Design a protein around this ligand. Structure first.
Ligand SMILES: Nc1ncnc2c1ncn2[C@@H]1O[C@H](COP(=O)(O)OP(=O)(O)OP(=O)(O)O)[C@@H](O)[C@H]1O
Ligand SMILES: Nc1ncnc2c1ncn2[C@@H]1O[C@H](COP(=O)(O)OP(=O)(O)O)[C@@H](O)[C@H]1O
Ligand SMILES: Nc1ncnc2c1ncn2[C@@H]1O[C@H](COP(=O)(O)OP(=O)(O)O)[C@@H](O)[C@H]1O
Ligand SMILES: Nc1ncnc2c1ncn2[C@@H]1O[C@H](COP(=O)(O)OP(=O)(O)O)[C@@H](O)[C@H]1O
Lengths: 143, 1487, 272
């Protein structure tokens, strides 16, 4: 049994794995943050298939790292928004998520400095207050 | 019991039992506190030893409890231990609060008083001052950011940065002047922390953080202090990111503070995220990147101690299990170092254990099953697993990873430099770090080199000490000249690149080889351009070195003159001694290390007025348990080890030895088994931790030095813990050795008239010993040749010096024997020149074959000017130098003796020949000086018997043989010493001498190189022999005292190292022992010797006496091509030695002994029969056997032409004593009929299995009977299975009365079972006088140890290992009964044991059966030489065509394949050689 | 057995293909003072020693093939490796891509030995001054970072500067239209993947790899000025496996480009 290749399949698998209640929590933007996290994880895990090009070596960006990232997002959203129905996009602790997902999670396995630079590039492209606009591009010039 | 107070659960079972028994002996519990606490090495009590006043560290810093705990009120061990722990926690918390108040007073100040500040530092511990600084800085930054909450406001956080800056400046001013070492460490730690705080505050200013909740501040590690909190332990809260840790408040003592580079902060963030998420972290990465130190520093910063397990290949589990469940119960952290190095099964076991514990820990977010026990795991438990590249599959989902790819060595260097007080630290760091990168890469790789991070830290600490010492020196100079003193003024005008280069040269130049020094200088000029360092030579010490060198007959120089390199090496050793307490000189044997440190000790004694005493201890020679001390398993009594004993003696200061300078020199190889105990002494801690728990503080004047030749097998830990000086072989040149030899000759007399003789001889030899002289050129040439053993310059030079000493003794004896005419100067010069040339030939080429001896002879003839013999072809080695200074041939010295008839081929008799007399002379020379020597030569060749002949020729030297085995250990030497010698007490000391007065005991070692070497390339007996040879004494492990050897000398013999089963000797041992190569006797020597035997043999029958000369000539002649053709290359058993020739003559004499008269044809028939039984049974191929037959025909005709071939050499050469009374020739038919009748009897009595009799069976049964009849009959039966080996062996044994014994070997047949069977056979053999045929097959052998025991039995006729204790006593009783029944009255154990050995060697008979595996044959010959040394072997092979035909007819005779209708075909496919011309049907079927 | 015959054939072909011998460099005090000479001497010594070992091993294999030589343990293991197509461990002393087979290893070894022979011939013809002006492939050398360090040390010695204050600048130009300054070293064989280098200016391209004509390494004093936002740091890997990091170059991307795009598309320079 193998995981079906594909960003669509990867995101569907991630959404199936995450419990339904955990994503639907008090801040409505938590669902958006989880979607960004799932998309980022799909982008990271897919680039492995192109091992010389997408990365420097076949890292183990498994499900455990995704679980830890989800845990961090929940912890920091609860800390920032203490039982609030709505939270502004700017007040979201973007720096905390970026730093923790560049150093702790997804950054533990990264030994080459250039892989760390590429990870920082994805993190600073995706996780930002700008993403909460309807005009945001998850990818550019795909075709 | 351990469930209550789980902190002492950390220690093991032994500590638990001891603390239970010795509860009232609180002075003995300090071992447990050393084990379980972090830095607490002892607890401070009063004179009553009943109340715990406080706790103390191993450094000396102590903590006094606010409310002391009285042990009397709580007699129970656990209750008062818990009280002590709670008390230390509370006291640390209260001291923390006090110091936080103090630093808050210090904080918020434009300027700070150095005196009050240093007082605050001295009041509290290093731990407390670092925590106080951290708390004050965190509170100040929090206050500033809270004031920043308005946003767009003025920033007083600049004031925070300015405060940190001004206190950093006062710290930098503090460390420049001299400080107490503990305060120095406190300052270093505080400066490290404040450098980190300044950098992070600068980053916060750069980012313009204005909110206390901003993540850029939250990611920095924050300390929060809450005095209002009731619990003191919960007062201090440490928070970084979203994680929160409550401070451990455990006493860590003093620890190496870790600089927080960006990588280290990343590590902290990752691990605190992992712990907050309740799962451990795994900082994988290459070695030497701070993987372990980072975890340790994280634990220390949180107040937790870490137990760093070392995961080597030799790793324990039960100790690990107990210690690790102890960590679980305590709550303290545990780190695994190089976790991948574990064995896969240990890897899986430890992975399962940590998996269970981690699962329990996540369940906690509580007890778990550990060692079949319930273990309460504290929530604060953490586990880290450093790995070197992955994590086990069962753990990959429970441990976060982190990459330690590269530490920030640049910032580490900068921060340490700034800590030591260096100005311009950044430039120096950016210069030094690439410099060690270049040293690691560009410099040639060597074993002892080390350019890691630790080396950089050591270099920087040493540079700091050097700058401090220069500051102190300039201060004293300004005190002498003028009075203006200003530390800042001196520091500002003090060069700093020069200081760092000086430290680099003082620490790294010593360990460089001669080639790498110009490269290092070029690297320094590349990185630190324009600046240079020139060492200021200690002109005070140089004069003392010159005086001591002149005293000891050495060579001294300065720089480029002769011996300058050695003097520089001694000075570098002096500097390393000055800056280190434990040293290790590395250099090839023959580099002057011993003399270097000895001369340095003498010079320091004569300079500083402090006399020095050296304790030279061999570590490998003595057992580790005796070296460090033994603790009885049952009586629990401690006996101090020799190193422990000498440390105790020095500490005791009984006769003022603390005033003296003691240098315990660990002369010998080092391996990580005993030295791991010494790893606790070579550190800055400097204390010995014995297994009993007691420690002895290392005095400052005691220096532990390891004079080891190479560092291929020492671990990196010991390499880093002590200084290193490299003594290249180029240090002392040949000129220095020559000068030392000549000076020692001129000064000390050899035993004055003979001193004058020595002086005159040295004057004569002086032109030849000069640089580029005859000796030097020959030594250069002799290195070009090939030798039986590895060549060492000191070995050849020592042999030459010893032979020159014998020359001087010869001249002294000559003058003593000619009082009327003392030998004149002219004859002295002639004799000394010729004896010199003789000595070069027999010393430089004394361990080589005749071809290279001749080559060296021709070369020296070309290059010398000394007159030499004009022999057209005879090499000068064949000529001696007579006491008259003339060249006389050795052949004149060779006599012509006639052996008795009854002594032919006897073990004792030795006919002197050319090689015999030459080796007699060399043995005489090397035994006169009591210099141990080794005879190296092929199996046989008379190495053993030549040695015994020379020794028994000398009257006053007794001899004791010791058959060294592959498992020989020095306890054999101890047993021999207590057997033949007795310890006696004398004023100099206890001396070991033989119980017999006026006798020089010699310990002949049968196979000196045979003992196996350990995994670290060490043979224990070799090291012990080296020790007694070189130190002139040894160590009695009974009381650990210097025992001096007197009237004791050693002699060895060995097979060539190239022969498999032999291990090459260590160059340190070979340097002492000259090696003589005893080769196979030549054609002339064999001719003469066996002509002597034959002339002795043929005296029985006078009518045939005139044929002795042609018989011996043919005997040697055939043997010549027999050795020349079947070389060892074709088959591993194709060896030929004069042992075979001796067996030839023995067999011929045995055949001729009973017979009264016998013609020439009978003699040739006997001679051919023995030749076929010795040189033709070993062959494999048929064509080789045909070759042997044809050449024996040719030889017999060549040397006996006037004889009939048909009668003397009739093809069925068969000899047997079964029919007639004598061993006369037997016809094949009569023998066949007799053996057929005997086989019928065998069927009737023993097992009935048909055995057809083809003539090969006749031959094999006769050979087997002949070997069993001869005493010590041992057979190596080889042939394809089922060829009749075992069956014929049993048949012969039954016929001759020997009982067949075979060992029932199964899968569970262990070595003990085989030993028991061998003991049973030995009892059945000698104690019963019943001959045993011992059946052995390689299938019955399951281990090489079986071959080792059998080898011992075959070579000695008995194995002492089998019988011991009650078994030996029962053997003694049985042999006493046997002697009583036979009629011999013996009482002592030795005579009865010798009689038992004689009974076994005359009765017991071992036969070995195997399959013809050529590679297998080589392997078995390699494993056990005894199966190939003396055991005779037969080549059964497979059945020939004739045997197959005969089996076919005889077995298929009952059936009737007689078909008259058969017609002969025109073409018959014949495969049987003797098929009848008309084939019958049955014949055709069998064909 | 047919495997023995085919191993004989391939061993003969390899022995013809691999060059014969390599000449060591002549030691001189002025040459010893030169660091480039030390590095090239070390390289030539290592290469000649390894070539001699490989030629001797193949000759012993051929002798076994004729039957005149028996298979010892080392020879048996080497024969097994050759038959299985796996690289012998004894031969592999320098860094090699993980998947490279024996035949490719022999071809690369032949090219490396030819480069070393050319270097030795040029060194013997002239001296250290000529040795500085030799275009050497980084991939061909055994330790190319040692060559970078050697050039750095050479410039530091020539201009009497300290090492820690020297920085690297890369000028990719055509081999014909190239200027060899005092601090400039010629390097060939670098292949840029993911971009095209024209006028020392990078641009994203869909070509898989662009061969750089000639890369010049210049060491200059640290300007202590921040790099422009258009400067991108490209890793230089030894082989396509991207397991070895030799050094990092700095290039100026063209206009209207985004350095984050260079990071995402995995642009890197490869020695081979
Ligand atoms: N300075 C010197 N000048 C002349 N001869 C010297 C000098 N130093 C040592 N020797 C001689 O050279 C030999 C070296 O002796 P030493 O025991 O010091 O050697 P070593 O290399 O340290 O030995 P090992 O490695 O076996 O312990 C001895 O014969 C000694 O007499
Ligand atoms: N900030 C730091 N980071 C890494 N190593 C450091 C640091 N400060 C000092 N060191 C030194 O690094 C040396 C090696 O660390 P070690 O734990 O042996 O690494 P490894 O885990 O690879 O064995 C230690 O002796 C230590 O003194
Ligand atoms: N020159 C010789 N004189 C006397 N016997 C000799 C001589 N050369 C060889 N031998 C024979 O060699 C045998 C002794 O060899 P041995 O001491 O067993 O050698 P090793 O001890 O090396 O095995 C004796 O049986 C003896 O007959
Ligand atoms: N001369 C012979 N004629 C017939 N059978 C024989 C003869 N010698 C041996 N055998 C057979 O070989 C068997 C025993 O083989 P054995 O000698 O034990 O093998 P190995 O020689 O390996 O010890 C017996 O069963 C016997 O029948």
């Amino acid at each position: 049994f193998e995981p079906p290749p594909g960003v669509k399949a990867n995101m569907l698998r991630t959404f199936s794995s995450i419990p339904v209640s955990r994503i639907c929590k008090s801040p409505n933007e938590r669902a958006r943050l989880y979607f960004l996290l799932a998309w980022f994880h799909a982008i990271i895990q897919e680039r492995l298939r192109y091992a010389p090009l997408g990365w420097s070596k076949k890292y183990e960006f498994g499900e455990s790292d995704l679980r830890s990232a989800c845990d961090t997002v929940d912890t920091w959203l609860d800390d920032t928004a203490k039982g609030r129905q709505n939270i502004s996009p700017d007040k979201i602790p973007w720096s905390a998520l970026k730093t923790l997902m560049a150093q702790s999670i997804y950054g533990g396995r990264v030994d080459n400095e250039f892989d760390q630079r590429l990870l920082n590039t994805f993190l600073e492209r995706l996780f930002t207050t700008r993403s909460f606009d309807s005009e945001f591009k998850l990818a550019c010039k795909v075709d | 019991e351990r469930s209550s107070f789980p902190r002492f659960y950390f220690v093991g079972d032994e500590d638990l039992l001891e603390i239970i028994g010795n509860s009232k002996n609180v002075a003995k519990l300090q071992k447990h506190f050393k084990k379980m606490f972090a830095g607490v090495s002892s607890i401070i009590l009063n004179e009553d030893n009943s109340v715990v006043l406080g706790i103390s560290s191993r450094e000396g810093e102590e903590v006094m409890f606010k409310t002391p705990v009285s042990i009397t009120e709580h007699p129970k061990i656990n209750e008062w231990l818990t009280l002590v722990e709670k008390e230390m926690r509370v006291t640390l918390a209260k001291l923390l609060a006090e110091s936080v108040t103090e630093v808050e007073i210090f904080g918020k100040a434009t300027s700070i008083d150095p005196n009050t500040y240093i007082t605050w530092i001295d009041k509290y511990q290093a731990q407390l001052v670092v925590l106080s600084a951290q708390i004050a800085w965190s509170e100040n930054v929090e206050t500033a950011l809270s004031s920043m909450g308005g946003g767009g406001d003025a920033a007083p956080l600049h004031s925070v940065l300015s405060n940190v800056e001004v206190t950093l400046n006062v710290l930098a001013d503090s460390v420049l002047m001299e400080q107490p070492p503990l305060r120095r460490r406190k300052l270093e730690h505080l400066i490290t922390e404040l450098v980190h705080q300044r950098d992070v505050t600068r980053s916060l200013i750069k980012s313009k953080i204005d909110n206390a909740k901003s993540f850029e501040w939250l990611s920095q590690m924050r300390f929060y202090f809450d005095p209002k909190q009731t619990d003191v332990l919960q007062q201090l809260s440490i928070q970084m990111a979203n994680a929160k840790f409550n401070y451990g408040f455990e006493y860590l003592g003093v620890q190496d503070k870790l600089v927080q580079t960006p990588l280290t902060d990343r590590c902290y963030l990752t691990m605190t995220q992992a712990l907050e998420a309740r799962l451990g972290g795994s900082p994988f990465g290459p070695a030497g990147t701070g993987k372990t130190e980072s975890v340790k520093a994280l634990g220390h910063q949180l107040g937790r101690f870490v137990l760093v397990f070392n995961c080597d290949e030799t790793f324990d589990f039960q100790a690990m299990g107990r210690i690790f469940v102890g960590l679980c119960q305590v709550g303290a952290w545990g780190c695994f170092d190089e976790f991948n190095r574990l064995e896969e099964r240990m890897l899986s076991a430890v992975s399962q254990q940590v998996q269970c514990i981690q699962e329990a820990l996540r369940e906690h977010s509580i007890t778990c099953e550990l060692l079949n026990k319930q273990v309460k795991v504290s929530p604060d438990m953490a586990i880290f697993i450093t790995m070197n590249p992955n994590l086990p599959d069962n753990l990959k989902k429970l441990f976060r990873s982190l990459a330690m790819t590269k530490p920030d060595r640049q910032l580490i260097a900068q921060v340490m430099l700034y800590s030591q007080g260096f100005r311009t630290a950044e430039v120096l760091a950016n210069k030094i770090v690439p410099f060690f990168k270049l040293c690691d890469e560009q410099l040639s790789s060597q074993s002892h080199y080390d350019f890691g991070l630790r080396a950089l830290k050591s270099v920087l600490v040493s540079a700091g000490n050097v700058k401090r010492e220069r500051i102190q020196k300039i201060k004293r100079e300004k005190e002498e000249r003028g009075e203006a003193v200003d530390e800042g003024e001196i520091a500002e005008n003090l060069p700093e690149q020069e200081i760092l280069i000086q430290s680099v040269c003082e620490t790294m130049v010593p360990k460089l080889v001669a080639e790498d020094i110009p490269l290092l200088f070029s690297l320094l000029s590349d990185v630190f351009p324009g600046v240079q360092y020139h060492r200021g030579e200690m002109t005070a010490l140089r004069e003392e070195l010159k005086k001591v060198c002149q005293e000891m007959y050495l060579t001294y120089g300065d720089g480029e003159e002769v011996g300058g390199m050695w003097v520089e090496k001694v000075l570098q050793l002096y500097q390393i001694t000055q800056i280190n307490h434990g040293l290790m000189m590395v250099g090839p044997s023959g580099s002057g290390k011993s003399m270097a440190w000895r001369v340095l000790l003498k010079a320091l004694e004569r300079l500083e007025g402090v006399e020095g005493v050296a304790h030279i201890i061999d570590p490998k020679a003595i057992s580790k348990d005796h070296l460090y001390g033994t603790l009885d398993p049952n009586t629990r009594e401690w006996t101090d080890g020799l190193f422990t004993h000498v440390l105790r003696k020095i500490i005791d200061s009984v006769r003022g030895e603390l005033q003296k300078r003691q240098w315990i020199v660990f002369d010998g190889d080092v391996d990580p088994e005993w030295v791991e105990n010494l790893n606790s002494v070579l550190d800055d801690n400097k204390l010995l931790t014995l297994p009993n728990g007691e420690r002895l503080s290392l005095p400052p004047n005691v220096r532990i030095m390891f004079e080891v030749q190479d560092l291929k097998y020492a671990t990196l830990a010991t390499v880093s813990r002590c200084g290193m000086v490299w003594f290249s072989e180029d240090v002392l040149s040949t000129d220095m050795i020559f000068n030392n030899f000549l000076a020692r000759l001129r000064s000390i007399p050899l035993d004055s008239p003979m001193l004058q003789i020595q002086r005159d001889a040295a004057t004569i030899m002086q032109p030849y010993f000069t640089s580029n002289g005859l000796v030097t050129k020959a030594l250069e040439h002799a290195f070009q040749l090939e030798h039986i053993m590895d060549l060492t310059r000191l070995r050849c030079l020592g042999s030459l010096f010893s032979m020159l000493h014998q020359a001087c003794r010869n001249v002294a004896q000559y003058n003593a024997n000619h009082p009327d005419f003392p030998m004149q100067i002219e004859q002295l010069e002639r004799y000394i020149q010729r004896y010199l040339v003789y000595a070069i030939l027999w010393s430089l080429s004394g361990d080589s074959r005749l071809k290279m001896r001749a080559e060296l002879g021709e070369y020296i003839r070309r290059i010398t000017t000394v007159p030499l013999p004009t022999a057209p072809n005879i090499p000068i080695i064949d000529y001696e130098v007579s006491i008259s200074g003339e060249w006389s041939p050795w052949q004149a010295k060779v006599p012509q003796i006639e052996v008795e008839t009854h002594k032919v081929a006897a073990p004792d008799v030795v006919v002197p020949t050319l090689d015999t007399v030459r080796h007699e002379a060399l043995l005489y020379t090397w035994l006169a000086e009591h210099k141990p020597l080794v005879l190296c030569g092929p199996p046989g060749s008379g190495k053993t018997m030549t040695l015994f002949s020379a020794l028994r020729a000398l009257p006053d030297m007794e001899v004791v043989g010791l058959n060294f085995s592959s498992a020989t250990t020095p306890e054999l030497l101890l047993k021999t010493f207590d057997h033949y010698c007795e310890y006696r007490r004398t004023p100099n000391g206890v001396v070991l001498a033989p119980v017999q007065l006026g006798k020089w005991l010699v310990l002949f070692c049968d196979e000196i190189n045979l003992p196996d070497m350990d995994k670290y390339g060490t043979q224990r007996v070799i090291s012990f022999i080296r020790q007694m040879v070189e130190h002139g004494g040894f160590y009695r492990t009974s009381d650990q005292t210097w025992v001096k050897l007197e009237r004791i000398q050693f002699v060895g013999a060995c097979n060539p190292p190239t022969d498999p089963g032999r291990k090459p000797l260590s160059h340190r041992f070979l340097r002492h022992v000259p090696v003589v190569y005893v080769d196979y006797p030549g054609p002339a020597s064999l001719t003469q010797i066996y002509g002597t035997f034959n002339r002795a043999m043929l005296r029985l029958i006078p009518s045939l006496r005139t044929y002795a000369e042609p018989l011996t000539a043919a005997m040697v002649e055939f043997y010549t091509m027999s050795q020349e053709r079947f070389t060892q290359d074709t088959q591993p058993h194709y060896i030929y030695s004069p042992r075979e020739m001796t067996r030839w003559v023995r067999g011929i004499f045995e055949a001729l002994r009973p017979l009264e008269t016998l013609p020439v044809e009978g003699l040739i028939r006997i001679w051919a029969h023995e030749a076929l039984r010795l040189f033709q049974d070993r062959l494999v191929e048929d064509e080789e056997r045909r070759w042997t037959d044809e050449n024996i025909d040719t030889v017999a005709l060549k040397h006996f032409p006037n004889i009939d071939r048909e009668k003397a050499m009739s093809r069925p050469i068969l000899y047997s004593n079964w029919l007639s009374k004598d061993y006369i020739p037997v016809d094949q038919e009569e023998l066949r009929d007799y053996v057929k009748a005997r086989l019928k009897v065998f069927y009737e009595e023993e097992l009935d299995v048909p055995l057809v009799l083809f003539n090969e069976v006749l031959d094999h049964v006769l050979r087997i009977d002949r070997i069993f009849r001869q005493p010590q009959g041992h057979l190596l039966l080889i042939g394809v299975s089922g060829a009749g080996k075992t069956t014929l062996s049993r048949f012969v044994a039954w016929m001759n009365g020997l009982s067949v014994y075979q060992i029932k070997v199964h899968r569970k047949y262990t070595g003990e079972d085989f030993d028991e069977d061998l003991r049973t056979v030995l009892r059945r053999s000698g104690c019963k006088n019943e001959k045993i045929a011992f059946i052995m097959d390689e299938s019955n052998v399951l281990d090489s140890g079986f071959l080792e025991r059998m080898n011992t039995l075959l070579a000695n006729g008995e194995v002492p290992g089998l019988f011991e204790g009650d078994e030996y006593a029962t053997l003694m009783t049985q042999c006493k009964e046997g002697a009583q029944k036979e009629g011999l009255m013996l009482d002592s154990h030795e005579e009865l044991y010798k009689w038992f050995t004689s009974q076994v060697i005359r009765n017991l008979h071992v036969v070995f059966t195997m399959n013809p595996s050529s590679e297998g044959l080589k392997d078995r010959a390699a494993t056990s030489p005894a199966l190939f040394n003396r055991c005779v072997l037969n080549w059964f092979g497979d059945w020939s065509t004739e045997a197959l035909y005969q089996v076919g007819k005889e077995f298929t005779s009952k059936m009737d394949l007689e078909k008259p209708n058969y017609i002969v075909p025109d073409y018959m496919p014949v495969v049987y050689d003797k098929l009848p011309q008309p084939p019958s049907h049955r014949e055709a079927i069998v064909n | 057995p047919a495997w023995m015959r085919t191993l004989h054939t391939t061993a003969s072909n390899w022995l013809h293909l691999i060059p014969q011998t390599l000449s060591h460099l002549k030691r001189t005090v002025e040459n010893i003072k030169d660091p480039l000479f030390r590095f090239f001497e070390r390289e030539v010594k290592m290469g000649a020693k390894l070539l001699q070992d490989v030629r001797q091993d193949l000759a012993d294999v051929v002798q076994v093939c004729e039957g005149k030589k028996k298979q010892t343990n080392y020879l048996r293991t080497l024969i097994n490796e050759l038959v299985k197509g796996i690289l012998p461990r004894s031969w592999s002393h320098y860094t090699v891509p993980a998947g490279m087979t024996v035949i490719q290893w022999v071809s690369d070894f032949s090219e490396r030995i030819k480069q070393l022979q050319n270097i030795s011939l040029a060194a013997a013809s002239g001296g250290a001054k000529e040795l500085k002006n030799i275009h050497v492939c980084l991939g061909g050398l055994f330790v190319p970072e040692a060559y970078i360090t050697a050039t750095r040390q050479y410039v530091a010695q020539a201009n009497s500067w300290s090492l820690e204050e020297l920085c690297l600048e890369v000028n990719v130009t055509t081999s014909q239209g190239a200027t060899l300054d005092a601090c400039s070293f010629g390097v060939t064989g670098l292949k840029l993947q993911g971009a095209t280098c024209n006028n020392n200016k990078l641009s994203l391209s869909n070509a898989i790899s662009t061969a750089l004509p000639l890369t010049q390494l210049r060491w200059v004093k640290q300007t202590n000025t921040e790099k422009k936002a258009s400067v991108v740091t490209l890793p230089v890997y030894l082989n396509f496996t991207r397991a070895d990091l030799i050094f990092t170059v700095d290039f100026e991307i063209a206009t209207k480009e985004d350095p984050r795009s260079f990071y995402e598309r995995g642009v890197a320079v490869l020695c081979t």
